Design a protein around this nucleic acid. Structure first.
Lengths: 177, 324
RNA sequence: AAUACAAACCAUGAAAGUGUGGCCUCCUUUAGUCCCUCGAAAUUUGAGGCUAGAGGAGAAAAGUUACCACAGGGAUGACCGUCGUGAGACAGGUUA
RNA sequence: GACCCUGUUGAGCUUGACUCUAGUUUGACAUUGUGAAAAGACAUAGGAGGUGUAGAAUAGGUGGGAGCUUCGGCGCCAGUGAAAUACCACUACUCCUAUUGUUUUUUUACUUAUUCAAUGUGAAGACAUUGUCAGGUGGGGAGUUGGCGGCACAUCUGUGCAGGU
């Protein structure tokens, strides 16, 4: 049992804030004083409350498997990964939102990339390589990814081109069964 | 004769001789013949919607438009529907992929309505292998509180983490402990839920191996195994709290060696445990004494579920309250 | 080659003959003591203890894969690029 | 081309020592009172218990015993049931009433515990709060890393059998 170290919390908050706008709102002193303190286990990070950590630090490390909700894991090279497990945290306070239609969400949930015919409506001032969160017509959080280009270049490109690159979806839920 | 009926049942249906002797002693032959017809008949598949995500008439409208035949399951379940036919596969539909509902049986419905989880409560589930049991308390409590879930195996541990994060509970800690090791290490839980593993005689349509692969060593070890589970269950529960917590014991067995005998041992050993009415509409009365063994006569409130009167799986539920 | 046996040789004794080259070898996986303890069980088992067959520089990062992508070596439309690496694109390419 | 090898990247699986301990931490204890309102459990005296099945029957259970008989009712026999009934001896608990009382718990109110303001008397107030152990974690911090000869002698411990020089 250990917390996030200096560089390890730096890269974690680097990749999080690439998709997050208010990191202050996620981890803040609440009414009861409990805080959303980060936590990692078996090279896999988690997002828990402090009072959750106290009632979980009583346990041997090998017996514990997960804790709270998961955010991602670290590779051998040290880069950070954010998973579809972090989607309810991610979609709660999302910066950039892209909405795809039902005939385009089905290839998105299968594992295919986002096409211009898939999206229904759009956000504004989206840069070329900025992160974004993918929604449907009914504001159901589907996934996340990095767009291929900016907003203005998406208007002037062919409708068959790839718009936003698909990183994760609910197929990991279907894979683990 | 009794021996002639036992030989005719074992030859025609394929049950073990010792298991058929137990079932013939448990029930009258007219009830046993309906039992042998019911458990060989496949059980219906029911759908439990996510109250944190949508409501019942919204999902019912969506699945009707997608082509799924639906029917609500009585008046005792406002959260459940029953599936008759579906042109679109249930696993590939957008609602299940988003996490609007989950698939379960009627046995997975009951012990969570037996519990009454409230907001900002501490709950335990020492055996939640399908993962639908832990989700429903989060659906009832509206994602407020702390939940602990225990699992013995890694294969079903990776199975449920795909289920809970699809459903979006966000506050349940799942792990790989021993349920006997749970109260000594952490303890101090307001509510505890136990789905004790057993022979599985209640559900043989899902598990056909129970018909033959149950020897005399099995009906001695598993009742002793769940005996230590309920001893761990009563040690985890708190006697006093701001919101009244309870112990809920559930199993998928129909024999009396797994039902109303273990809960009699826990009641006799610990006087601090009291059993109350579980608030359940349909069920069967507990037996005061079955095989030369005098149980406590307060077990009339303990409920049972049988496959022939209702379209449910074989099940058994008990509720307890701690005093000291 | 070792080993068994036989013969030769050798030591001693004057001869008669005799003579020689032992017994052993912390946890994890497994079985027993069903011995002792804790339990269950209308009398038989479960978990520990005990016994005996076998294994074993430390937080900086490592080992390994009939595995994936890329580049290179061997054996029998296609490139130099620029812009990103979690995936890719190009009115950029030697002529009119 | 398949195929084999090398370097980088992912998917991984396993390891990343031993002993304490911070960070911690689970449960219980005392500080922690005084009244009112209640509830539960233990002291009692009593009314009544008892079906999963079948058995005419709602079978506590135990020991005898086959008519004490007020009657041939039921005992007996006989099904049916793990347990069979007449009879007279015992005690296990349960659903309750009341008190002939002991405790425990929750809420409210007040300050007498606790803690703050002033600082050389006041307030919040029995909520917090502090101390004590019985457990758990701890990679962060501290310390560490093929053989047996032969009692064949003398002196000491043991204090013939032994051990040490």
């Amino acid at each position: 049992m250990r917390p996030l170290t200096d560089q390890e919390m730096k890269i974690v908050l680097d990749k999080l804030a690439n998709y997050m706008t208010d990191l202050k709102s996620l981890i803040a002193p609440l009414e009861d004083g409990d805080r959303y303190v980060f936590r990692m286990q078996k090279d896999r990070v988690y997002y828990v409350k402090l009072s959750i950590a106290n009632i979980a630090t009583c346990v041997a490390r090998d017996k514990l498997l997960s804790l709270g909700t998961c955010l991602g894991k670290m590779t051998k090279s040290g880069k950070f990964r954010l998973h579809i497990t972090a989607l309810p945290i991610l979609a709660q306070n999302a910066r950039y939102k892209i909405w795809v239609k039902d005939n385009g969400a089905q290839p998105f949930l299968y594992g295919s990339n986002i096409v211009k015919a898939h999206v229904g409506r759009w956000t504004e001032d989206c840069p070329e390589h900025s992160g974004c969160v993918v929604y449907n017509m009914a504001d159901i959080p589907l996934g996340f990814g990095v767009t291929a280009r900016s907003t203005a270049e998406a208007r002037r490109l062919d409708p068959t081109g790839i718009v936003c690159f698909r990183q994760a979806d609910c197929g990991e839920y279907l894979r683990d069964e | 004769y009794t021996n002639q009926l036992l030989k005719d049942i074992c030859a025609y249906y394929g049950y073990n001789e010792y298991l058929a002797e137990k079932l013939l002693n448990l029930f009258p032959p007219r009830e046993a013949f309906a039992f042998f017809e019911a458990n060989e008949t496949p059980r219906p598949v029911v759908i439990r919607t996510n109250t944190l995500r949508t409501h019942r008439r919204d999902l019912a409208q969506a699945l009707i438009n997608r082509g799924v035949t639906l029917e609500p399951v009585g008046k005792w379940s406002k959260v459940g529907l029953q599936v008759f036919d579906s042109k679109v596969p249930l696993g590939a539909t957008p609602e299940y992929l988003a996490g609007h509902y989950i698939l379960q049986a009627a046995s997975s419905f009951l012990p969570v309505m037996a519990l009454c989880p409230q907001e900002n409560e501490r709950c335990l589930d020492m055996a939640a292998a399908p993962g639908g049991k832990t989700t429903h308390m989060a659906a009832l409590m509206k994602n407020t509180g702390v939940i602990f879930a225990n699992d013995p195996s890694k294969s079903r541990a990776k199975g449920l983490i795909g289920n809970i994060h699809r459903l979006g509970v966000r506050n349940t800690i799942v792990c790989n402990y021993d349920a006997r090791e749970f109260p000594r290490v952490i303890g101090g839980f307001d509510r505890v839920l136990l789905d004790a593993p057993c022979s599985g005689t209640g559900v043989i349509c899902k598990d056909p191996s129970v018909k033959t692969n149950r020897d005399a060593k099995d009906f001695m070890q598993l009742p002793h195994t769940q005996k230590q589970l309920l001893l761990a269950a009563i040690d985890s529960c708190n006697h006093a709290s701001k919101t009244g917590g309870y112990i809920v014991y559930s199993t998928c067995s129909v024999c009396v060696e797994e039902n109303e005998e273990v809960v009699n041992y826990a009641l006799s050993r610990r006087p601090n445990v009291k059993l109350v009415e579980t608030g359940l509409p349909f069920g069967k009365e507990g037996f005061t004494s079955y095989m030369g063994k005098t149980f406590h006569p307060s077990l009339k409130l303990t409920r049972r579920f049988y496959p022939h009167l209702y379209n449910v799986d074989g099940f058994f539920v008990a509720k307890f309250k701690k005093i000291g």
